[PDB]
Amino acid sequence: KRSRKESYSVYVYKVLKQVHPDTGISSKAMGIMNSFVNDIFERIAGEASRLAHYNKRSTITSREIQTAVRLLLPGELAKHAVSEGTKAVTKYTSA
Amino acid sequence: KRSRKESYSVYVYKVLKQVHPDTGISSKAMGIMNSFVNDIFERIAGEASRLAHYNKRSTITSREIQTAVRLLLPGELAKHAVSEGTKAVTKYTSA
Amino acid sequence: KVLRDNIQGITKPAIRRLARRGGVKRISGLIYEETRGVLKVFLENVIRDAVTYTEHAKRKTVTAMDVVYALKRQGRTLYGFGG
Amino acid sequence: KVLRDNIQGITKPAIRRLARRGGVKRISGLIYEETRGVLKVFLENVIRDAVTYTEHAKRKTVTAMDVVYALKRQGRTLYGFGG
Amino acid sequence: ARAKAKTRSSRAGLQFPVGRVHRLLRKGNYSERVGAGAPVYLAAVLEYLTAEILELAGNAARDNKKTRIIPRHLQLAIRNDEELNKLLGRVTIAQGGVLPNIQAVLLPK
Amino acid sequence: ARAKAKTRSSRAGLQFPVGRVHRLLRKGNYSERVGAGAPVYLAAVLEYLTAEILELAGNAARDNKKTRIIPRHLQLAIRNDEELNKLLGRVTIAQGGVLPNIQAVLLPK
Amino acid sequence: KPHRYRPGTVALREIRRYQKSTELLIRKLPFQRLVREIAQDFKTDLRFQSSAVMALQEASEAYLVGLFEDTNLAAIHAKRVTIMPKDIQLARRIRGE
Amino acid sequence: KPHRYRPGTVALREIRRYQKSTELLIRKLPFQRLVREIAQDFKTDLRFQSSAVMALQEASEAYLVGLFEDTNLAAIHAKRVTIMPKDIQLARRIRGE
DNA sequence: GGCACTGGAACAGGATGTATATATGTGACACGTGCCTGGAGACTAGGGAGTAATCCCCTTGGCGGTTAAAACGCGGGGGACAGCGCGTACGTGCGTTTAAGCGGTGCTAGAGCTGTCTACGACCAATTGAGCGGCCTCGGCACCGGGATTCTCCAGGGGATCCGGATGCTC
DNA sequence: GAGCATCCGGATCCCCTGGAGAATCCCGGTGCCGAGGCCGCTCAATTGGTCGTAGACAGCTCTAGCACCGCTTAAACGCACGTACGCGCTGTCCCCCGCGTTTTAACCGCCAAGGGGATTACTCCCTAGTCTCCAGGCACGTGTCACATATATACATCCTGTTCCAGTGCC
């Protein structure tokens, strides 16, 4: 008996099968992916936290997250992320 | 009258007046001091939150910020600042 | 209204003064336009951050504190103009 | 129990291999001891941070996630070790 | 009596967990209160990021004739993309190596 | 019949405000719980830092025959100690200039 | 015959003069024109606090003098005293710019 | 007469091999011995998870590789092909150490 | 002036090292399964936040004057740089020692899970006194001005050196 | 008497150095505006008490980290010969500093005007929180084929022997 440990294996696996039905992973590569997603999540969340600090807003919104993405992500990665997140927010709002 | 803007000037006047009763202060230098203390405050508070997360501790205590000072502030100031802080917290322990 | 050429406003004697502050003994003639380009890169890199904070703040005017944030995000923290 | 002189445990051919991965084709013989010193200072910094983290953990055993915390706080972030 | 439970990731049409990332923000000590759409937006951003980097990794592995991705392929993916390299100049990948990169003067003739 | 309102900064015997810094950590969003000794420790360490840097600024001002501190004194104070340089490697001081430093080969014979 | 200093003498006196001084080196109004020109390329009709301009200035000379200190060190590493564009490119690449 | 390559051709060969390769370049057991030896100076009786030692080994290897390619840039900048220690002090001091 | 001597350039071929094709096992990747706790659903309190109105303040726009900075040109000296020689210092190849590395085994220290509770710390009404806005004065300092001191560059003066003449000695 | 040696004195050539200008420093002199301190306000720290809960402690367990050990070569090392490189010198050429003269727009400073920060009020949209319920991700088992390893071909490559050719010295 051990305590359950959180992971992103199944979600990244689904995304990989979505982009590449025929490809596999190594476990070391998955460790890099977990470190990657946790790292980017930490970066964006902390940046949004200080934006919430700076406008004295005690509420964080997707506008703040979008500001952080445009601020941190270089180039068209930012605007692609804004497009995808905007679509997700709209179809979540409709659902 | 205008709403209050809280700042750290007068404390700097008091501490300098203890260490150098004679000297004067230019105001933009005083702003540089406010930027110093606010910057170091944010660094130590961020390390405190990070260590409280890593030990999964809900409470910010002196002991982990001591750890944070040993991390960020190097060497001689680190050990001496530890000394004055331990003296201060023991004095507050004696109310 | 619009502006088209102000990179030359950082004059060659001004760049010479900057080099004298940096301890540069001799300055080539090819240095100046490169410094104009590099300075342009840095100022645009920080001002895109600054305009991002200003549009997020729902303000139209650029404030200094946002510029301080924009420099400290790249770890080039400037002291004395906060608050 | 006590180990005394493992600084030369980082052998010369290992440094040659690292220079090959670094893209160096020709390496002076006067390089290796300063590279040992630079590696030495870097490892001192990271394990000092690591033992500080571990001593906060009240553990006698250093662990990997504490090490990667020490690296990212030093600005040399690692992936692939439980981050 | 009660409606069927429907996952919020399916509402957003996303693979990343809306509820888990929402909980992580709530216990991540970033704000006292979190808007509903912000974790959805963040999960979409991360999902796009992982999607593109996994596409690059799969293409690199297909170049290497391997059906399973390797940390070497990940290093090749990060460093051969300028924009991700600008995102990740300060990162270190375990067992990744570096790009094949030889300076031109180092070559003979 | 309440006791006289005496202050925690005086209780630690220190000049920096314990209450303001405690409040600033409480709504600075670093934890939901905070101990009482942590703001005391924090006020102590910032007072020590300001004390030493103000010592250096005062000596720099007196060496330049000024009885009022200027940011040039602050720059000369921070840059003339290597350990504060490791504290402040990436920090910009307004109107500070740089240290008077000429490379030796630049000097004439 | 009018007095004329040898090359580098007035340069080193400039080194001492501008390095002891803290006062500004960029003419503030052509700089502010450049700032507004770059700003209007990203969002139109931006308005500037003067302190925002000032900070943008202090930071720029800070970044530049960091580059020329690095440039001087790499140039004396290159056994020269005259700086060349490859040196600034090298300094930016070593900094990861 | 036995075969012998001219110098550098071999060197470029293991440059290609090791820059292609992914494995750790330094010996393992002296690296645990060294990290135990130096961690002995800060605190007594430390125990090391092997994963932590491997992570330290990878971090050290990447840091040295970055330092070495920076010294490569410095050396080709100085129109030489052989590195010398002042390249390393230059690269570190430009980097900020 | 030509033929022989010496240095140059193009070419082929062997040996090696790395790729490449195919056989094989193996263990790490991938999938099936129990579960339980973390996610979802519904209702409530309540509160940060968006928005309307104002105001004033701080930014923007424009216009005269002056000058210091900028810019252009001449000159030259200084510095980059190319090329050649030279001595060296790793590079590479062959042999050798060793010590890392792998497989195996035992002990255990401490990492980590689980139960208790008790110290400790957020929450809230009252209150007051410390801390900040307003103001006012003045003296530390910015600007101006003149003399000293120190730096710098040069034209010249001073020392070093060598050779010729005189003279005393000597044969 | 004559020839030689040698010492002294002047010619000459190369190397130092004092002197003059000038840029900055330093000492007064003046007038000025930011700093510092006093005063009034206000809101935030403090006091006290309460209730809830987070971590310290204890205890147990199991697991992984260390220690020992025995082969087993891979790798470290070292030496030797060689050839490529750092570097130093030196000539050369031209690029930028110094300096002077002319332009100009930067800056002060002065005045008009309004765009928007920003600040208070209002009313409301959303979201933490609680309770219940349930299903998706994790633990864990299993099996299995993608890849590491191994071996046999195959070609790149890389360096050197072979062959043809141009420039130049002596008869």
Author numbering:
A (entry chain R), B (entry chain N): 30 to 124
C (entry chain P), D (entry chain L): 20 to 102
E (entry chain Q), F (entry chain M): 10 to 118
G (entry chain O), H (entry chain K): 37 to 133
Quote the authors verbatim.
H1 binding to stacked nucleosomes depends on the NRL, whereas H1 always binds to the non-stacked nucleosomes 2 and 4.
In contrast, the presence of H1 on the stacked nucleosomes 1 and 3 differs between the four arrays. H1 is absent from the stacked nucleosomes of the 4×177 array, but is present on nucleosome 1 in the 4×187 and 4×197 arrays, and is present on both stacked nucleosomes in the 4×207 array. Particularly high Δβ values are found for entry DNA at nucleosome 3, except for the 4×207 array, which is the only array where H1 is observed on nucleosome 3. However, when Δβ was higher, H1 was not bound, likely because a stabilizing contact between loop L1 and linker DNA could not be formed. Altered linker DNA trajectories, as observed in our 4×177 array, sterically preclude H1-linker DNA contacts that are required for stable H1 binding.
